[PDB]
Write a protein that binds this ligand. Structure first.
Ligand SMILES: *[C@@H]1O[C@H](CO)[C@@H](O[C@@H]2O[C@H](CO)[C@@H](O)[C@H](O)[C@H]2NC(C)=O)[C@H](O)[C@H]1NC(C)=O
Ligand SMILES: *[C@@H]1O[C@H](CO)[C@@H](O)[C@H](O)[C@H]1NC(C)=O
Ligand SMILES: *[C@@H]1O[C@H](CO)[C@@H](O)[C@H](O)[C@H]1NC(C)=O
Ligand SMILES: *[C@@H]1O[C@H](CO)[C@@H](O)[C@H](O)[C@H]1NC(C)=O
Ligand SMILES: *[C@@H]1O[C@H](CO)[C@@H](O)[C@H](O)[C@H]1NC(C)=O
Ligand SMILES: *[C@@H]1O[C@H](CO)[C@@H](O)[C@H](O)[C@H]1NC(C)=O
Lengths: 99, 21, 50, 324, 99
């Protein structure tokens, strides 16, 4: 084994797995990591990109390394929870709200 | 009215946008 | 008067540390200096805005 | 001959997609309205950071540093059926060309070949990678905007100083450009293709369009940058004293005192020549904190004190600030 | 190495160059690196010092030991640049203004 002479040329295996859809999970798309729902998109890519971006410079679309189908990345449902109460001096029933 | 219609047509992560009340 | 302070760095003059310190080793002192100067400029901007 | 380049020198920075959003990238790009050489003499061509190539039959490229067997080099040949990329060292002719029965050009990678349409090539070599950009546009440099496409990349990890071309036979005309780093704004389409680019290093209006992320501007004053004059020459004045500071006395002394009984010597009002240091064997030292050991001649100071002692050897690094 | 406020005495044997005036250049006076245009100094003081400060704590005086002459340090041309332009849909001619 000889190092400190050239960049990376030969590496080892990667142990790829299957694909899931319609769920927000963490992914490793050739170095890109993030959480988002894997959904089929409508746009078309030229045959030399790997992933796309937006005005926020974040991950919104990616090309799978196994096939030629374009994917879309969107985060799932999240937000700050809100509460509605009449006060402890009047009643005890509460109405929880998702914003 | 057509005035507000024309006015509405004239004018155009981890982040949440609260809708107006 | 606040610009010309050392801010805990090795040197106060801008081009003195560019010739006295190593250019690979000059990525900390001037970084802290420009961070503090950005803080001072930010608080000056807020005061001017108010 | 001198030929002005109008629009050429535009390529994709990364393999990314943007939905018609302006983006600023600071990489090696060929500037707008820069003259390039129109070669017609059957030589040596200098190479710099980023080169633009163009031709109107003629094929082959020569790469290397000194064109000999003492350094690495690159060679690419794509005649009619396949392309080969050879990275090795070999004897290279002074005026190499091709004959199609004989070949007198004096690992291997094979890919698809690269075949009115004009041959446009941009060669870039940074960070030990060789990126190839090619495009053919059907229509003397062509008029109209065109965007190139990237090709495969091979991590050669070598250095390139000069480059040459090859003449294929079944002089000629070929264009050689030079690139310098600057900033550019690239506007994409909804298909994902670049359709409009502008430079911002030739006119103040271009700089105004450069900092607003749009090709359309309104009437008004837009502050973009500063105006400042560059220093044409330099002046240095050193004090007039020639006494040849006796550093050899404090260094090459016949005997030393103890560690706890160290002596102190003051050196001032003389001239310090920092060239006798290297005549005292290879060192386990010369790393310095708070001062640059490479830049030991430009700075001038005073109050020089030197002390001498001995160390066991297993605690050489113990003479350092912070280690107690 | 001591960086006490004093004229420099010991450094390299590099030769000095001739004096230049009315040009924004970079100067090195006994280890004091600075940039600016050199002008004759109308200011004066008691002849026992080397160099002084100002309100901005910058360099405003020098007394090189080769020739006992007081020189003044002042900044050269500086400032922002602005453009006067009409609508780009009608014309492209612009103007250059210095502030
Ligand atoms: C990677 O391997 C997969 C194995 O399934 C390839 O997918 C098949 O490719 C063949 C050849 O075109 C098709 O006939 C099959 O229909 C594909 N199967 C599926 C489930 O998609 C895939 O093409 C390979 N990718 C590359 C780049 O070689
Ligand atoms: C452009 O022309 C000028 C004027 O002769 C010349 O100095 C310069 O080298 C030319 N640029 C090239 C050949 O890239
Ligand atoms: C050869 O390449 C190395 C990169 O590791 C570079 O540092 C060196 O300057 C190159 N040689 C020449 C003569 O440019
Ligand atoms: C871009 O996409 C549109 C569909 O919205 C299509 O009509 C058009 O032909 C495409 N253009 C190119 C150059 O692919
Ligand atoms: C160095 O030369 C200058 C030039 O006139 C002179 O004024 C000065 O006295 C000299 N230095 C010494 C120490 O004599
Ligand atoms: C150019 O744009 C300005 C700004 O909207 C507008 O006022 C003007 O009428 C336009 N000119 C033409 C010829 O359309």
């Amino acid at each position: 084994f000889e190092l400190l002479h050239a960049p990376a040329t030969v590496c080892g295996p990667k142990k790829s797995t299957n694909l899931v859809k319609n769920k927000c999970v963490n992914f490793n798309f050739n170095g890109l990591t993030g959480t988002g729902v894997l959904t089929e998109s409508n746009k078309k890519f030229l045959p030399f990109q790997q992933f796309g971006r937006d005005i926020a410079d974040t991950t919104d679309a990616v090309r799978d390394p196994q096939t030629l189908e374009i994917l879309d990345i969107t985060p799932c449902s999240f937000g700050g929870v809100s509460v509605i109460t009449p006060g402890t001096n009047t009643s005890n029933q509460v109405a929880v709200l998702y914003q | 009215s057509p005035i507000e219609d024309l006015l509405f047509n004239k004018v155009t992560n981890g982040l949440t946008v609260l809708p107006p009340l | 008067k606040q610009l010309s302070s050392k801010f805990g760095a090795i040197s106060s003059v801008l081009n003195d540390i560019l010739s006295r310190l190593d250019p690979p080793e000059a990525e900390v002192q001037i970084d802290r200096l420009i961070t503090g100067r950005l803080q001072s400029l930010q608080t000056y901007v807020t005061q001017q805005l108010i | 001959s001198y030929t002005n380049s109008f629009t050429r020198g535009v390529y994709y920075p990364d393999k990314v997609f943007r939905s018609s959003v302006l983006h600023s990238t600071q990489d090696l790009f060929l500037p707008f309205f820069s003259n390039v050489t129109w070669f017609h003499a059957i030589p040596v061509l200098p190479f710099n950071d980023g080169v633009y190539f163009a031709s109107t039959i003629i094929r082959g490229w020569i790469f290397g540093t000194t064109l000999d067997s003492k350094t690495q080099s690159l060679l690419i040949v794509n005649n009619a059926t396949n392309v080969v990329i050879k990275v090795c060292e070999f004897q290279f002719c002074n005026d190499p060309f091709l004959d199609e029965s004989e070949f007198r050009v004096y690992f291997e990678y094979v890919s698809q070949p690269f075949l009115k349409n004009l041959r446009e090539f941009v060669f870039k070599n940074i960070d030990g990678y060789f990126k190839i950009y090619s495009k053919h546009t059907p229509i003397d440099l062509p008029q109209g905007f065109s965007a190139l496409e990237p090709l495969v990349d091979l991590p050669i990890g070598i250095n390139i100083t000069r480059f040459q071309t090859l003449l294929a036979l079944h002089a000629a005309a070929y264009y050689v450009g030079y690139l310098q780093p600057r900033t550019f704004l690239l506007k994409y389409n909804e298909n994902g293709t670049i359709t409009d680019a502008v430079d911002c290093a030739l006119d103040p209006l271009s700089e105004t369009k450069c900092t607003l992320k749009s090709f359309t501007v309104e009437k008004g004053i837009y502050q973009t940058s500063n105006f400042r004059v560059q220093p044409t020459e330099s002046i240095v004045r050193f004090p007039n004293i020639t006494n040849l500071c006796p550093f050899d006395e404090v260094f090459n002394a016949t005997r030393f005192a103890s560690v706890y009984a160290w002596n102190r010597k003051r050196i001032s009002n003389c001239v310090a020549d920092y060239s006798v240091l290297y005549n005292f064997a290879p060192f386990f030292a010369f790393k310095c904190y708070g001062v640059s050991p490479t830049k030991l001649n430009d700075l001038c100071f005073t109050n020089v004190y030197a002390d001498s002692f001995v160390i066991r050897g297993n605690e050489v690094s113990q003479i350092a600030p912070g280690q107690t």
